Design a protein around this nucleic acid. Sequence first.
RNA 1: GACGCUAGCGUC
RNA 2: GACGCUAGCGUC
Lengths: 121, 120
Amino acid sequence: DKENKKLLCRKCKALACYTADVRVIEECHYTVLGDAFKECFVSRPHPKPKQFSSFEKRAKIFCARQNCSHDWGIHVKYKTFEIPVIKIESFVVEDIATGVQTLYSKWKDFHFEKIPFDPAE
Amino acid sequence: ENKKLLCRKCKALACYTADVRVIEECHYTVLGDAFKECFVSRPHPKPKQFSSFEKRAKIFCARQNCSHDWGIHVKYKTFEIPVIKIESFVVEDIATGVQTLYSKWKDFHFEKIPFDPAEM
RNA sequence: GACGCUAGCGUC
RNA sequence: GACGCUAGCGUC
Ligand SMILES: [Zn+2]
Ligand SMILES: [Zn+2]
């Protein structure tokens, strides 16, 4: 099934977002739309910011819970956007209908409705 | 179908899948003296005990300018046999020449004959 | 060897 | 972020 699911912080199990809000960039990197998600993480400047492809890595992002702060990925400037790029190995996927939890390590293995990124949203 | 194993670094022939035997559905060895000629052994720098056999030596390609790490040599029951890691080799289908790079034994599906003490 | 983990480095 | 490579540590 490619039904909607929620991502929970792997360390504290707090809700982070839903698969409906996830968008794919270059069929390789995954970001999250919406302002609600922006409240769920904090950023911190990247100690070794490197550049590659079409965007620029500025900071790492972590769980906003002060009792977690699990590494969630990075924040990058892509074209004219400042957007979060998350790594799936930092989360637990939960199916909304059953509660079943899955621990993935790479995005290639997680098969869900991978809605491509739309600059208009 | 039968396949041969080549050294990942220099592509030298190591053995054929027909000679491979599985111990406790988890560790892979090879029978016959021909294979014994293709590798050299070396006392393991971190020997240790687990399950039913002791890790005594590290083994490497005998070809010297290659010397690619192939695994270890162990004492298992009344035999001392080599145990190899597929990640150190290229699998080539003999009929087609197609070369395959595996990382884990779980992924290479072939006739996995269990080790039998009466042979070798 | 079979798996897991930490650190570091390299490419777009 | 996505891969890739080292080194070390642990378990059986
Ligand atoms: Zn958390
Ligand atoms: Zn070799």
